[PDB]
C-alpha cells in the first residue's frame, strides 16, 4: 500500500 500523501522528496 502507498500513502496518498507524504513530505515531497527534496
Amino acid at each position, epitope marked *: *500500500k*502507498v*500513502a*496518498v*500523501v*507524504r*513530505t*515531497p522528496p527534496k
Partner: antibody
Amino acid sequence: AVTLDESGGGLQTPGGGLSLVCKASGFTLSSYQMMWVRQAPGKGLEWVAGITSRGGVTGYGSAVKGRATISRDNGQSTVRLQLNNLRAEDTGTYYCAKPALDSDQCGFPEAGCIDAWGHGTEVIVSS
Amino acid sequence: ALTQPTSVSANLGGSVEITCSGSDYDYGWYQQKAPGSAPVTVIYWNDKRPSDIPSRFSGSTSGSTSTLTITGVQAEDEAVYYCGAYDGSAGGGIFGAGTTLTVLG
C-alpha cells in the same frame, strides 16, 4: 499496548482559542502519520486535521480550515491540535487517531486506515 | 460525502450487511456503543480485522462500495457503525453518517 491520551479540553471561550494534546505511547510515534477526529453532540464522526510523520504536510477539514493548526513532537511522543475563532459548532468530543500502517502506507487523511482511537476529550464552547 | 444506511436490523445469531459508498479509496469500519465514547475499529483497509476483534466481523470492497458483514450476531454487537475513507476530490478524511444496528428479539 497502544494508547492515545488526549488533554486540553473543557470549557472554552467563544471566538477564543484551545490547545489539545495527544500523548502517544506503546509505539514509535515518528513511524506514523496522525489525525484528529471530532463528534458534536448528537452527531457523527467528523475528520478534523492530519499531519505526516515529520510534520512536512498538514491537512484540515473544511469546518476548521484557516482556524486550525496541527503539529507534532516525535521526541516528546505528542500530537497537538490548536483551534482559534472558536464557535458553538466546535463543541464536541475530540479524538486522537492512529493509522494501522506506517507513514509510507497510510497518509493522514486516510480515514479508512484507523486502528487506534484515544479516549477522547470534551470541548465546550461557551461564555 | 459517504453514504451508509441510517439503520439495519439483525436477529440474534443471524447475519447482517452494512454498505458504504462515496470514496474511490480504502474503507474502514468503526464501532461506537455510546456517543462521546472512543470508537472501536472492527475493520480497516477494506478487509483487515484488528487482533482483538472476533472473526464474525468481515469487510469487502467491490468496486468503490464497502460491505461490513457480521456473521452470527451477538447482543453486544448493537452499536452505531461509522464508515471512514479518504475523500479524493477534496483531500481530507470523510466519514459516513453512521448505521444503527438493532439486535431483534
